[PDB]
Every structure is written in structure tokens, then in C-alpha cells.
Design an enzyme around this catalytic site. Structure first.
Site, mmCIF file in Angstrom:
data_model
loop_
_atom_site.group_PDB
_atom_site.id
_atom_site.type_symbol
_atom_site.label_atom_id
_atom_site.label_comp_id
_atom_site.label_asym_id
_atom_site.label_seq_id
_atom_site.Cartn_x
_atom_site.Cartn_y
_atom_site.Cartn_z
ATOM 1 N N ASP A 95 -11.762 2.758 3.302
ATOM 2 C CA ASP A 95 -10.626 2.605 2.379
ATOM 3 C C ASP A 95 -9.564 3.650 2.764
ATOM 4 O O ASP A 95 -9.305 3.809 3.966
ATOM 5 C CB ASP A 95 -11.140 2.572 0.924
ATOM 6 C CG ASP A 95 -10.121 2.282 -0.166
ATOM 7 O OD1 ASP A 95 -9.459 3.258 -0.655
ATOM 8 O OD2 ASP A 95 -9.995 1.086 -0.541
ATOM 9 N N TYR A 149 -0.632 5.830 -3.191
ATOM 10 C CA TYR A 149 0.062 4.547 -3.126
ATOM 11 C C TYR A 149 1.577 4.773 -3.252
ATOM 12 O O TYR A 149 2.355 4.093 -2.584
ATOM 13 C CB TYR A 149 -0.435 3.642 -4.249
ATOM 14 C CG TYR A 149 -1.906 3.300 -4.153
ATOM 15 C CD1 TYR A 149 -2.871 4.125 -4.731
ATOM 16 C CD2 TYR A 149 -2.332 2.138 -3.518
ATOM 17 C CE1 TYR A 149 -4.210 3.796 -4.656
ATOM 18 C CE2 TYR A 149 -3.672 1.815 -3.405
ATOM 19 C CZ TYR A 149 -4.598 2.628 -4.021
ATOM 20 O OH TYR A 149 -5.920 2.339 -3.904
ATOM 21 N N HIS A 155 -15.472 -5.287 -0.177
ATOM 22 C CA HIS A 155 -14.800 -4.047 0.153
ATOM 23 C C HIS A 155 -15.797 -2.886 0.268
ATOM 24 O O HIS A 155 -15.684 -2.075 1.188
ATOM 25 C CB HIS A 155 -13.657 -3.808 -0.828
ATOM 26 C CG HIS A 155 -12.811 -2.638 -0.449
ATOM 27 N ND1 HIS A 155 -11.898 -2.689 0.580
ATOM 28 C CD2 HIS A 155 -12.744 -1.391 -0.965
ATOM 29 C CE1 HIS A 155 -11.281 -1.527 0.671
ATOM 30 N NE2 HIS A 155 -11.792 -0.722 -0.270
#
Lengths: 288, 287
Positions: B98, B206, B267
Site C-alpha cells: 500500500d 492523500y 488488497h
């Protein structure tokens, strides 16, 4: 008859509209990123039987564009349409709403049923359905990526408008299930509307006022009276913006008679993709 | 025995868990994890290596500088470069999931001398992400939450309220088998999430690196090719990342490369097939 452009003051803003025909008032209300012109294929045919009025909503094209997010709350947008029915010298209208025009139409009808004779919705989720179901629908949250994008100040305006609104043309063309749907001429007319000073900010303010993450993820239950006017929902099933999760089970929202016409081979812009069938379903509903 | 430690790197104090001796093997987590995501790999890998699993800048027990700009990728990669040095080593085997994968790709590209071998789990190459995302409806749709995270305060509030119910839901929705996390697990995650400043810091990744300016940049991204042997492990049922982003990774690697696909995992591949992942990692290294 011939297509006439007018301006009228409503609720403190000047609103542009095109009109053709005489009879009952029939309002056609566009959404994003459209204006009156999205109704080009229905205005002439409907004008044979009705006094057709297609306005530019607050913030769009030739209509006034007040500053600030708070001026684009749904309550004020519905009041604009209530005011427009009055200013056109009528008590009620048949109201047809696509997209944001539909959301406004649902709101007008729920809170001011006396002002709406019949309601037609094209590809616009009931606001309470949206507020209830969206946070519980991965599919809808995914489709609503751009709603979150539009929350941020300035950056979305810049990205959507740069290179002669290439990003916006692409978003639009990606959404159609019919090819070559906009002519080069059409695109030039859309760009003129998009380019009006303040228009793009004003349009995006609809999402910032009504579909910010606070509203979407609200734990508070939403007060929304049942729809008490006869209703037709027209629905292109290949809608890139809206999950079917949001349109099923309208029963709990609508007390008056209603019907849903599904167009399984159309998407969001159902009035562009099956223009004649949409025109027909609208006429038949009113005239029967 | 699993030991907890702290060390100063690149001006921040970083917490890590460690077990084993041998070559330095870094395990780097992503969002919304911490060292604990590596729970099923640390013991087995510790049989052969000096396993170090840190909390990245802003997470759990590591320092949490304030301000979006302190979470730019360049600073996060420098944290790991500094960590290798501060552990008294010249290089490490680097495994990244990730965000930890994105950092790993960046460290490897710009500092190949610091990385002996690279392992990536379910992390797109940064240039692949920056190039392809704006051209992939599927990716933009999957990245709804990346746009959500851009707004100040409101995402913190929504994610944390009701004991992080929204975040637990996001996480559990992403697993291919449900009931993957025990009630105990979820309480351990909530402790890490609840650390003062942690959630803002995590969301700053982000805001710093995947804001709409970066995603819709017209400018081309300069990123050196990977010059160290690379293994990509990939759960195909990834709710966060489209396959559009992982095709032709060879174009980014000028070194030996291989990709092991897990078609029945998502994921969190290291949680869903913990033993197989551990095996593929060991083999790759010991080879």
C-alpha cells in the site's frame, strides 16, 4: 410558433428561459453540465400541445449567478421554480426535471404540491433515497467520485475549464451510450454556455451546498414529505452517475399514483438517446 | 522475542518492532495499518533475517509532524533511507504494502544502493498511478475516497465517530473473506487509530501526494527505472486499485522482475494468504 427567449425576475434573481407553444405550463428543468439547450429535441414536439418553458437554473448560462455556496441550497433552487410558475401568471405547472433539475423537481413537489400538477423525473434520485442509501452503497460512492472531487475549491474549476473544457467534454461523452450525440456545432454552443462568467463555479456550488460529505454521511434522518402528485420516472439504466440501488423501492416515498419507465439501453441522458420515446411517454402521461 | 524500539531518523522519532538477526529486512505497512499488519509474517521471517517493521511517519507510536507538506512522498522515502542508516546498515531488503509499497518504489528508484531487493504487495508504481489514473474511469471510481480525503476535518470526523465504525466498514468491505479481524484485532487497530494526530497524519498522505492537481497534472513525471531485483505480490480482487495500473510493470524495471498473482485475494493479500506470501518473500530473498 417560434422559439422565443425571455428574462423574468423571480425570488430576487433574473432568470433566462426559452418558450414555445400555448396551453398548460410545462416546465423542463436541465441539470449539470447542461442548460435549456439539452431540451432541443423535446421543445418543438411538446409545444404542439403545451406552453413549454425551459429555463436556465440559478448560476447557469444567461440566468443570474449569485456568489457563495449558500445561494445554491436546494431550498432556494426550488423557491426559484415556485417563483417562476407565479411570475409566468400560473398557479401550477407540469414539471419535468433531469439530473439537478429532477432533484429540484422532487423538492418543489414534496414541499409545494399545490404548485405541481404532474411530476416527471428523468435520471434524478429522490433526495431522501440519495441521503439514505448512498453511504450504504459502495457502487454509488464509487460513481460519486466526482462529487467528492467537486467539493475542493478552485482546483475543479481549473481542471474542468482548461483546454476549452476538454475534461468536461470527455466526462459528458463518456456518459453517452449513443455515439456522435453532440455535433461540432452543439459543442460550440455548450462551450459558450460553460464560458459565461461565474457559471462553472455556480454549477459546482450545487454539489458543495447539497452533496458535501457532511450531508452524505449525516446520521440525522431527513425530513421529506411524501410525493402527493401523480409522478412518472423515466430511467436510462446504463447511468454512470447513479446506481439502480437509488431508484428501486420508490413506494415508501410516493403516496400518489406513479409509474417507472426503464430504458435498459439508455444512460443518464435518456432525453438525448431516445428523444422521441421520452417525448411520447411525457405527452401520454399528461394527456391521459 | 518481538521487541519494540524508537530511533531518531531525518528529524523524527520512529517506533518499530524487531525480531531475528541476519540481513536487515524492512516491512512497510500502509493505510489504515501500522506494524501490526505484519503480525503473521514477522515470526516466520525472523527465523532467517533481522526483521524490522516500523510505524511510518504519522502512524501509531512514530512522530506525527503537523501540516500536509510534511507527508510528501520525498520526505517519507527519506525517513526509510534514514532508518536503514540509523540501524547501522548500508542497504536492506524492502517489503512494502500500500503506501509502504509506494514509498518502497520511490526509495528503490532514487536510492538503489540502499535496497538489496524490493518486494511490493498491492501498491501501484507511482508513475503508473500518476499516468494512468486520470485515463481510467474504473480507477477514478475506486479512488472516490481519495477525493473524499482532500476536504479538511470532515473526513477525520466521519471516519473516527462511533469508535471508527466507518473506517472498520471500509476495511472489512475490502477483505475477500469476512470475519478476518477478531474483536480483539479491531480494538488493537482502534488504539493505533486513536493516537493523537494519527488520523489527520494518515489522511495527509492523500492530501500531499494524491490531491486533484497531481492526479490531473498534464506534466510528465520523471522517475528512474528500478535497477534492483523486484517481486510484486498482487491480490487481484483489489477494491482500491484497478488492474489497469499494474499491466506492463516491466516497462518500469531494468532488473530481474517477477509478479505472483493471487486471484482469490484482495488488497490485504498478506492477511488472506499469510503463509503463501511469507513463502514467496523468503524464496525470493534466500535465492
Amino acid at each position: 410558433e417560434m422559439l422565443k427567449h425571455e428574462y423574468v425576475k423571480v425570488n430576487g434573481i433574473k432568470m433566462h428561459y426559452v418558450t414555445q407553444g400555448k396551453g398548460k405550463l410545462l416546465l423542463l428543468l436541465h441539470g449539470f453540465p447542461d442548460f435549456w439547450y439539452v431540451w432541443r429535441f423535446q421543445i418543438p414536439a411538446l409545444a404542439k400541445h403545451f406552453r413549454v418553458v425551459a429555463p436556465d437554473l440559478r448560476g447557469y448560462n444567461e440566468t443570474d449567478k449569485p456568489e457563495g455556496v449558500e445561494n445554491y441550497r436546494l431550498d432556494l433552487l426550488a423557491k426559484d421554480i415556485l417563483g417562476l410558475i407565479k411570475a409566468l401568471g400560473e398557479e401550477h405547472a407540469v414539471v419535468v426535471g433531469h439530473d439537478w433539475g429532477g432533484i429540484i423537481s422532487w423538492t418543489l413537489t414534496a414541499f409545494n404540491p399545490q404548485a405541481v400538477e404532474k411530476l416527471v423525473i428523468l435520471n434524478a434520485p429522490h433526495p431522501k433515497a440519495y441521503m439514505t442509501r448512498t453511504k450504504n452503497s459502495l457502487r454509488q460512492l464509487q460513481k460519486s467520485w466526482y462529487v467528492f472531487f467537486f467539493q475542493v475549491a478552485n482546483i475543479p474549476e481549473k481542471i474542468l475549464s482548461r483546454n476549452e473544457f476538454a475534461f468536461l467534454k470527455n466526462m459528458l461523452i463518456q456518459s453517452f451510450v449513443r455515439r456522435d450525440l453532440l455535433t461540432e456545432e452543439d459543442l460550440r454552443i455548450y462551450v459558450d454556455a460553460w464560458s459565461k462568467s461565474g457559471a462553472l463555479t455556480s454549477a459546482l456550488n450545487y454539489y458543495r451546498a447539497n452533496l458535501n460529505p457532511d450531508i452524505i454521511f449525516s446520521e440525522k434522518t431527513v425530513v421529506f414529505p411524501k410525493i402527493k402528485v401523480p409522478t412518472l420516472v423515466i430511467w436510462g439504466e446504463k447511468d454512470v452517475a447513479i446506481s439502480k440501488d437509488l431508484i428501486v423501492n420508490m413506494e415508501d416515498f410516493i403516496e400518489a399514483p406513479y409509474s417507472i419507465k426503464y430504458f435498459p439501453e439508455c444512460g443518464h441522458w435518456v432525453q438525448l438517446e431516445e428523444p422521441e420515446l421520452v417525448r411520447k411517454h411525457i405527452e401520454e402521461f399528461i394527456l391521459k
